[PDB]
Amino acid sequence: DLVATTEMYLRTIYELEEEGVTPLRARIAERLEQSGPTVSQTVARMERDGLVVVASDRSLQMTPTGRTLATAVMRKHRLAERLLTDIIGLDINKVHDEADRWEHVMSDEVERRLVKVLKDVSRSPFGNPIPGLDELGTRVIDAATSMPRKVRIVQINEIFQVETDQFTQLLDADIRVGSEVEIVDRHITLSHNGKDVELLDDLAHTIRIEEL
Amino acid sequence: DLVATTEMYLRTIYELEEEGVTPLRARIAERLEQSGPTVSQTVARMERDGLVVVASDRSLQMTPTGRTLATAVMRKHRLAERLLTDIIGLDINKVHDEADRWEHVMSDEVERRLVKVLKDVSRSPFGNPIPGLDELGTRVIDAATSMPRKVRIVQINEIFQVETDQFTQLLDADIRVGSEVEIVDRHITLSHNGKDVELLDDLAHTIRIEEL
Ligand code: NI
Ligand code: NI
Numbered sequence A, B: 001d002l003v004a005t006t007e008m009y010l011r012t013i014y015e016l017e018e019e020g021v022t023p024l025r026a027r028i029a030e031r032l033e034q035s036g037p038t039v040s041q042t043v044a045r046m047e048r049d050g051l052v053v054v055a056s057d058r059s060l061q062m063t064p065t066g067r068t069l070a071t072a073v074m075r076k077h078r079l080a081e082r083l084l085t086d087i088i089g090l091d092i093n094k095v096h097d098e099a100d101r102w103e104h105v106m107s108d109e110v111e112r113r114l115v116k117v118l119k120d121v122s123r124s125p126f127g128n129p130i131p132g133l134d135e136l137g138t139r140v141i142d143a144a145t146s147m148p149r150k151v152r153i154v155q156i157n158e159i160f161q162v163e164t165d166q167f168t169q170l171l172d173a174d175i176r177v178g179s180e181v182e183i184v185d186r187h188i189t190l191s192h193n194g195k196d197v198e199l200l201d202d203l204a205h206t207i208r209i210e211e212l
């Protein structure tokens, strides 16, 4: 019982972060269709197991081990969805639910085979990047990690820019003095309410952020 | 926890029958690497759930519902093994263990797709017929069912036979006055210690059996 449950809590926190939603226990209860009390019980165990910390604001911060496990479950889940759609041909309306089960029993080595056999594993069939593939086998340029983080805009410093076409991109995605997600890819891209601005490097080095 | 466990007990009983072994609780404990007491506890629940009867000789007789479920789990298991070998290309030494997990989470509709996509679903990669495909979508000729049963030879009646090449087949598979398995296929075949004699109809109507 217990292992699949933990993984589901983890993938759900992972999911909410990808969606920009604060990982709150009531948000997890609602999404998993579980009671709040029930969720509190599992989260308590997960804290005990070192997988999550409940911050003073009641959000759930996955620890590095928790996040590794979350990432793995998300990876299996999305690879299973790929397998089910691409090869098996299961009706798309059933694919998620099936992968909801298969994600807890797919081995790493099966994953590795899927990566060999599938045409593309960039994205699930539902449009989301498949993470953790590598593991399977302050200025923005300095501050971003290979792990999504929300930060606060403290300076944009347009005045120092030569290229200006991204000024309007920033205005259109609404930040100026706000709280944005930051990541390094193949680098740097910023997000704010499901609107992404992929920064060119000159901007990535002048934009400054803080926690928080 | 409980559903996968029940299915495993069921597939194991199914297995022992296919192998000609009396479904004894100590044989199930040994095969599942579970304690006897532990197995007694689950079997008791399974009796309560209507899936098995413990006969006076201590063998486990699957009820019709139990057998249907056993057959389904065996089917998913073997189809999963096919999928893993044929398409996925998982190392054959890992295929069983993986299917040991996937058998408990594969839906009927995924099965139906597998039957569409796979080259042949007659047999698992380990040489055993895949059952339950139809469900997914006394003289021997009269006594045999579409379900394996052991019976006792009461008469062979060679004297009434025109064709005699199967006389030696019977002698070679060692029966004469013994306890044999009987089944109807595409009919009738008899088995005795992993030696099969597929009867021609003239013999199937003269050979007589009893319980038991
Ligand atoms: Ni999904
Ligand atoms: Ni799941």
Ligand code: NI
Pocket (backbone or CB within 6 Å): B077, B081, B096, B099, B126
């Ligand atoms: Ni097997």
Ligand code: NI
Pocket (backbone or CB within 6 Å): B008, B099, B100, B101, B103, B104
């Ligand atoms: Ni199993």
